[PDB]
């Protein structure tokens, strides 16, 4: 008997050791667009050296022009309006803000904030319902109260920031709707592979989409969770493209590289090592799920298939 299967390593961590303690500033609002903004229509750039890839390899762009997805970090309401306008130039279909954040977040006086616990794991272990209830309660409790909002600096701890008495509170759903985007939430934990529940939820949602839907994915930084769902969408929509091409091209338009690479973390971040290894293994397993289940139209969900076809370290 195995306590936690591959793909579920985070279930072994204790939520009580990462409880939220500060309203973290998610974006300072200085730039017109959020960080790491990219779309599937973008030109491929040279790969980042840390992934030790072949800079001479040219991945297939088959299906990219029709993929219709984008990704970014968190944003201020003004930045999201800029994103929405930019994306409307590319499609006449519904544009979705696909919020991948498990952490409670929202807007206080229009400032994007999140209730941050160590490793951004303040809602670790909570069901999506419980995470969203926490978020609603916390945002409502901030109205007309004094809050401390701060960017994280040295040691991933607050440094500087501002103190204000809040006059307006909004959820991201409200901000997305104000920007003209549809909204869909998947509560995925920062830094780790999305859970079978997260992925089943995404696949059920994907199946409901009209042909011309545009998906704008984001979490906090626009790297791990954001690229994971962009990669899964590319695999689902372009199943004839090789795994190597999908991973190279999603990295080369500005995302994380989800293939094998020599992992090296700073000593203070050594806890991340096994989670990067787990993601590499799980990306391969998701590709296998798509290849094995697309012909019959996915009559068995990812969670069930993964239980009978466990991933191996």
């Amino acid at each position: 008997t195995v306590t936690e299967p591959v793909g579920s390593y985070a279930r072994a961590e204790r939520p009580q050791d990462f409880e939220g303690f500060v309203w973290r500033l998610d974006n300072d609002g200085k730039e017109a667009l959020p960080r790491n903004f990219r779309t599937s229509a973008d030109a491929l750039r040279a790969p980042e050296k840390k992934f030790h890839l072949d800079a001479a390899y040219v991945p297939s762009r088959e299906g990219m022009d029709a993929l219709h997805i984008s990704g970014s970090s968190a944003f201020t309401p003004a930045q999201l309006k800029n994103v929405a306008a930019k994306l409307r130039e590319k499609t006449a279909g519904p544009i979705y803000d696909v919020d991948l954040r498990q952490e409670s977040h929202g807007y206080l006086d229009g400032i994007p904030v999140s209730w941050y616990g160590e490793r951004d794991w303040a809602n670790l272990g909570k069901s999506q319902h419980e995470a969203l209830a926490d978020e609603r309660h916390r945002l409502h409790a901030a109205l007309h109260k004094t809050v401390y909002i701060a960017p994280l600096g040295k040691h991933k701890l607050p440094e500087g920031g501002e103190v204000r008495r809040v006059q307006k509170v909004q959820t991201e759903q409200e901000v997305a709707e104000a920007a003209g985007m549809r909204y869909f939430r998947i509560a995925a934990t920062d830094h780790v592979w999305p859970t079978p529940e997260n992925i089943d939820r995404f696949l059920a949602f994907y199946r409901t989409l009209p042909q011309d839907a545009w998906l704008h994915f984001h979490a906090e930084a626009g790297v791990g969770r954001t690229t994971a769902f962009m990669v899964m969408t590319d695999m689902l929509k372009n199943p004839s493209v090789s795994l190597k091409d999908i991973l190279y091209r999603q990295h080369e338009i500005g995302g994380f590289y989800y293939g094998e690479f020599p992992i090296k973390t700073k000593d203070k971040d050594s806890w991340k090592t096994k989670y990067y290894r787990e993601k590499i293994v799980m990306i391969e397993q998701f590709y296998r799920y798509v290849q094995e289940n697309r012909a019959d139209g996915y009559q068995t969900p990812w969670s069930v298939w993964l239980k009978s076809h466990p991933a191996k370290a």
Copy 2:
């Protein structure tokens, strides 16, 4: 005709809702054996600080200092208070009081001294002492078994670094004082401003019933403004024959603030403090007058009552 706020009460014009608490501030890092600015009335006088533009050649009278029996300091960890108590016990066989002058809610989380800090350290501004202590009791209790962020203030008087911990023990300063072998007395005085008539009436009633050999250890957060104000008050009350100049010079020269006139200079960001420094200078003078004019009948008239009939002038 009607004056909204008299001299001595300027802080009543400030709006409490603009300075609400937002972080557990680290009050002392615990690295030294004693709290900062620790001094006693038995100490030798040192040269005055240049910023006060005093006469370095002046030799203040030490009349009554040997029997004064008071000390002052900044906030402290429990270990530091035990070291203070041991040092004071070498100087007296009477009861030693921890006279906590802090209006801000504070206490100890896992033995770490913290305070609920709002801008200007005014998180309990405008509250009665009853309300301030109720806030403190509730906040300390609510921290038990919960995760808290404790941080020192750095650039811009805002949190910088610090630590995050799940609290396993909570204590009030009263508990910490009793564990150190000291009696405890609380006066909820607001940081940076002249103590209120309510604060001073409370102190005078307390002073009147003290045993002859009581030793009073005063402290607030830094061991400067409120700490020195009450040390000066006590010196004046106990040694009424000593001149105002001697009291102010000597309390400054053993390590306290200088409460007489001086060239007030503030950084632009601290310009709000200017009028409060001026107010403290005139109120120190007014308190000296109260002591001189009310000692003969044994202070039958409370300070608050006397001050309303003899208001200070700006």
